[PDB]
Amino acid sequence: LKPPSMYKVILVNDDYTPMEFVIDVLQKFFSYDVERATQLMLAVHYQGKAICGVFTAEVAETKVAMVNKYARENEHPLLCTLEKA
């Protein structure tokens, strides 16, 4: 069989995206409670990036695509990326 390959799903910092939006994303797509979501968002703002979750490759691809889709639908340049864990 094939063991799981785990990928980091990361959010990358950009000056033009509302902080509210980022939180909105975290609760919506990562089922984070508000308190944790805020923490991650602050991480994105100052560290310039923050790992939101670790998922199997297929789940991770889906998340990234859905987030970027959601961002562009709302006219924000916010970017979500994968990285081999």
Add this chain to the structure above:
Amino acid sequence: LKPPSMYKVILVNDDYTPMEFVIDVLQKFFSYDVERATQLMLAVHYQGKAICGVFTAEVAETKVAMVNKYARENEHPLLCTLEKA
């Protein structure tokens, strides 16, 4: 009288089916708890096959067909077979 004809329902190892999926199958179709499902999966992986259950011929046919069905719609090669017990 007629003794029931018992058939082994077996899972066969291939290098492309996620281990996650196999466990999903075991709980779903064989009402296994997660811990057991894992053991069987490891057996399939290392031994190249594992007996998931022993059922009457009619029940066994049904299982096999439903498993392979489920596998194909999830686009996995995993093969479920029968063998006279």
